[PDB]
Design an enzyme around this catalytic site. Structure first.
Site, short mmCIF file in Angstrom:
data_model
loop_
_atom_site.label_atom_id
_atom_site.label_comp_id
_atom_site.label_asym_id
_atom_site.label_seq_id
_atom_site.Cartn_x
_atom_site.Cartn_y
_atom_site.Cartn_z
N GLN A 19 0.92 -1.28 -0.05
CA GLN A 19 -0.02 0.08 0.03
C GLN A 19 0.82 1.25 0.04
OE1 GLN A 19 -2.41 0.31 3.42
NE2 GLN A 19 -3.79 1.68 2.96
N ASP A 124 -7.32 -2.53 11.34
CA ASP A 124 -7.48 -3.18 9.83
C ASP A 124 -6.95 -4.63 10.00
OD1 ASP A 124 -7.94 -3.49 7.19
OD2 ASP A 124 -6.11 -2.58 6.80
#
Ligand SMILES: Cc1c(-c2c(F)cc(C(N)=O)c3[nH]c4c(c23)CC[C@H](C(C)(C)O)C4)cccc1-n1c(=O)c2cccc(F)c2n(C)c1=O
Length: 261
Positions: A19, A124
């Protein structure tokens, strides 16, 4: 604050792109094998992350991927972590006996009980950021990092990368994160483990998944999960956050099922 001098790092292999950009394998001061995350500019709130990194250093548990330090006197910044040679759990699952699947759940639950004790939210939790070492031990990684992400595809509830499939109703309705939203995500992680890395609610889009969850619908029992194991993951998905167990309770439930099965 643990500032690492980049002159003490070697860059030995490219592990791919996450990411935040490029991840490398290297050595730190010839002593530790490390993963070096090179944080592409514009992907993270570095100032806010650097303040939190001092708190993240102090988090130390055998089942948490260790943060060794940061390189912040430059851009891109580097995040230096423990090296996990088998990569992420999602790909490890997709590449086992039922007893090994429950041990993976135990490993993560031990790390999450530790984070819960420190009042530190992962935010997350999912198989894609759990990592696996050379001995098959699973560890939790990237805890707390999603709070510093700048890309709207990941931050917005209607974004293409938002983890709708790991989110409880109070996150989808109010963006209310707590230890109990990490519990919900843990249940989805157990489902991922017992499903050998299948996508949760694969038949639905992100919008259809939020509607399914709003009607009280839940993920079905994977065939590798016994009734006792499914009861544990399902307990994580109570509509009411306050009725979900703690990681302390979940760990005891897992240890009981292990001793029994
Ligand atoms: C984990 C990851 C890493 C990564 C990391 F960050 C930290 C470490 C660590 N601390 O050691 C680490 N170690 C290894 C890797 C890796 C990758 C595999 C290596 C081998 C030697 C096995 O080839 C070993 C690096 C790039 C991409 C991803 N990555 C994936 O691979 C991925 C898959 C499915 C789905 C996803 F969503 C994924 N996402 C988003 C993602 O970032």
């Amino acid at each position: 604050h643990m500032e690492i001098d980049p002159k003490d790092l070697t860059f030995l292999k490219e592990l791919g792109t996450g990411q935040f950009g490029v991840v490398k394998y290297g050595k730190w001061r010839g002593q530790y094998d490390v993963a070096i995350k090179m944080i592409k500019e514009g992907s993270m709130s570095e100032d806010e992350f650097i303040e939190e990194a001092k708190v993240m250093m102090n988090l130390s548990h055998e089942k948490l991927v260790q943060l060794y330090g940061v390189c912040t006197k430059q851009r891109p910044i580097f995040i230096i972590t423990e090296y996990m040679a088998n990569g992420c759990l999602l790909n490890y699952l997709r590449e086992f006996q039922t007893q090994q699947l429950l041990e993976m759940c135990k490993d993560v639950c031990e790390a999450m009980e530790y984070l819960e004790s420190k009042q530190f939210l992962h935010r997350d939790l999912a198989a894609r950021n759990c990592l696996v070492n050379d001995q098959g031990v699973v560890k939790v990684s990237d805890f707390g990092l999603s709070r510093y992400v700048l890309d709207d595809e990941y931050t917005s509830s209607v974004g293409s990368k938002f983890p709708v499939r790991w989110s409880p109703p109070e996150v989808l309705m109010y963006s209310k994160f707590s230890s109990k939203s990490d519990i919900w995500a843990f249940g989805v992680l157990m489902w991922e483990i017992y499903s050998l890395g299948k996508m949760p609610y694969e038949r639905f889009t992100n919008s259809e998944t939020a509607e399914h969850i709003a009607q009280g619908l839940r993920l079905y029992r994977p065939h590798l999960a016994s009734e006792k194991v499914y009861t544990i993951m399902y307990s994580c998905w109570h509509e009411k956050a306050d009725e979900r167990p703690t990681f302390k309770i979940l760990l005891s439930n897992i240890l009981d099922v292990m001793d029994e099965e």
